[PDB]
Amino acid sequence: KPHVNVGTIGHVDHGKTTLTAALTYVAAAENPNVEVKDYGDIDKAPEERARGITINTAHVEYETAKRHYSHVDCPGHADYIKNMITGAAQMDGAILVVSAADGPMPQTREHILLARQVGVPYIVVFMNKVDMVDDPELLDLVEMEVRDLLNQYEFPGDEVPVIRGSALLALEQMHRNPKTRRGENEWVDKIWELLDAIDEYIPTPVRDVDKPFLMPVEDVFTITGRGTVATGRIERGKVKVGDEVEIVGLAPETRKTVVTGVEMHRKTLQEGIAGDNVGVLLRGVSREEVERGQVLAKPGSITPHTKFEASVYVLKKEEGGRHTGFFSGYRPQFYFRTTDVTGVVQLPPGVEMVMPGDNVTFTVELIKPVALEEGLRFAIREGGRTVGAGVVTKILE
Numbered sequence: 001k002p003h004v005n006v007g008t009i010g011h012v013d014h015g016k017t018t019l020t021a022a023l024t025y026v027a028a029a030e031n032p033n034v035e036v037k038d039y040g041d042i043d044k045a046p047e048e049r050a051r052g053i054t055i056n057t058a059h060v061e062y063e064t065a066k067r068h069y070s071h072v073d074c075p076g077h078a079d080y081i082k083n084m085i086t087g088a089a090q091m092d093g094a095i096l097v098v099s100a101a102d103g104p105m106p107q108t109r110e111h112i113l114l115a116r117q118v119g120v121p122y123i124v125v126f127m128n129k130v131d132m133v134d135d136p137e138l139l140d141l142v143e144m145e146v147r148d149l150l151n152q153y154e155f156p157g158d159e160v161p162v163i164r165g166s167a168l169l170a171l172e173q174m175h176r177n178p179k180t181r182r183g184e185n186e187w188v189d190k191i192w193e194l195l196d197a198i199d200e201y202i203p204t205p206v207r208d209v210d211k212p213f214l215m216p217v218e219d220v221f222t223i224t225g226r227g228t229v230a231t232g233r234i235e236r237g238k239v240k241v242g243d244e245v246e247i248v249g250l251a252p253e254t255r256k257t258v259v260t261g262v263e264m265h266r267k268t269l270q271e272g273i274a275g276d277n278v279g280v281l282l283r284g285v286s287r288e289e290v291e292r293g294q295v296l297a298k299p300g301s302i303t304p305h306t307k308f309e310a311s312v313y314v315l316k317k318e319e320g321g322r323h324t325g326f327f328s329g330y331r332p333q334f335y336f337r338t339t340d341v342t343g344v345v346q347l348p349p350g351v352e353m354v355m356p357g358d359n360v361t362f363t364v365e366l367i368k369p370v371a372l373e374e375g376l377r378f379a380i381r382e383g384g385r386t387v388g389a390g391v392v393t394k395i396l397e
């Protein structure tokens with residue numbers, strides 16, 4: 001059975017974690033290899049249990065007749081957007097959870113836009129909490145609103161599956177009868193509609209290995225005796241022990257080193273490929289030479305830059321942005337892969353300001369170099385709000 005990565009996204013409290021638990025229980029009735037997980041086993045940290053909130057992304061495994069799934073359950077709270085982005089970057093498809101009782105909310109919109117920015121190719125929708133809605137008209141409206149949102153963000157909104165169900169009632173049924181099978185219960189069958197939907201709508205992924213190697217540095221560790229280890233998810237290409245690599249960005253100059261080891265969890269590998277979360281041991285360099293925000297790459301394949309042009313969508317308040325636009329001189333934070341760097345905006349000649357809801361173009365000068373290339377997507381934040389989502393269109397300096 002091929003392996004596929006999926007996950008749950010959506011506004012705070014709409015039901016992501018409860019749905020994740022339900023998925024493990026429902027799938028386990030048809031497969032003895034699946035380990036069932038209760039709500040408290042997913043939101044397992046003391047703080048998560050205390051306030052009933054997802055803080056850390058959780059990784060759970062389950063399977064269908066067709067595939068083995070690794071599911072990343074993401075937090076919906078704005079305070080943990082970094083963890084949500086980190087989780088979305090691992091997904092081959094995402095399950096957008098939308099409460100039928102509340103309808104789309106700011107992070108319903110923001111999560112779809114950000115999922116697109118990180119490269120999630122497909123979204124399946126689970127309209128949750130329908131057990132709380134007795135009005136069929138409202139359900140139709142919520143579905144229309146969600147399909148409209150998906151269309152607005154360039155996903156095939158009229159094609160995507162929109163499953164109407166109750167994660168809670170399905171989970172309660174599985175607790176009462178862990179062997180409930182297909183066809184026996186309406187709520188459990190809605191979970192099967194979702195499992196069948198991810199099986200048929202999320203394409204079997206093809207790792208992006210036919211490209212020069214690049215891995216954003218997530219974190220850096222010094223293993224006593226072994227050396228400096230840079231962790232990250234390989235974005236493209238492959239890396240083998242003995243390969244020469246460049247550390248690009250942030251520092252005054254690019255630095256070269258050699259890969260002396262590749263590991264994944266407690267496994268020693270001789271090579272890592274696109275899609276792998278790995279620890280890369282680097283020759284000679286210390287933590288003073290490799291840090292979060294830099295990238296490791298095939299030498300000569302990407303260079304550091306500070307000035308670029310970009311196409312940017314300016315977010316509205318209801319999408320996580322602001323009601324007001326901005327002018328030349330604006331100094332927000334720019335996020336490229338694992339980099340966070342301040343930059344200064346310069347609007348094109350004749351453009352006084354750019355407004356929320358518009359797709360505009362402008363120039364940016366960063367305060368430190370970043371590994372940049374045409375086609376690189378990014379986000380702009382200011383004051384804890386996502387003000388723009390963009391893509392680099394031209395390298396100037």
Ligand SMILES: CO[C@@H]1[C@H](O)[C@@H](OC)[C@H](O[C@@H](C)[C@@H](O)/C=C/C=C/C=C/C(=O)[C@@H](C)[C@@H](O)[C@H](C)[C@@H]2C/C=C/C=C/C=C/[C@H](O)C(=O)/C(C)=C/C=C/C(C)=C/[C@@H](O)/C(C)=C/CC(=O)O2)O[C@@H]1C
Nearest residue numbers: 089117218232233263264265277278279335336337377379
């Ligand atoms: C044993 O000790 C250590 C450790 O504990 C072990 O860990 C288990 C470790 O084990 C290793 C062997 C191994 O098993 C473990 C390896 C671990 C690897 C971890 C990998 C990851 O997190 C990756 C998914 C991420 O970087 C991921 C791609 C990164 C993660 C990046 C997250 C960024 C968040 C920013 C938030 C902003 O405020 C924001 O509000 C906003 C809206 C920004 C949007 C930004 C966008 C849109 C950027 C895009 O330009 C883009 C394409 C982003 C996607 C991106 O780059 O994601 O060994 C060590 C030695």
Ligand SMILES: Nc1nc2c(ncn2[C@@H]2O[C@H](COP(=O)(O)OP(=O)(O)NP(=O)(O)O)[C@@H](O)[C@H]2O)c(=O)[nH]1
Nearest residue numbers: 012013014015016017018053054076129166167168
């Ligand atoms: N009535 C009803 N309540 C539900 C349903 N699904 C989840 N809930 C409830 O709504 C609350 C939030 O659920 P939870 O799964 O934690 O939501 P979340 O989207 O994971 N939250 P966060 O964004 O913090 O991660 C809980 O009290 C939970 O029992 C459902 O189908 N029906």
Ligand SMILES: [Mg+2]
Nearest residue numbers: 016017053054
């Ligand atoms: Mg949750």
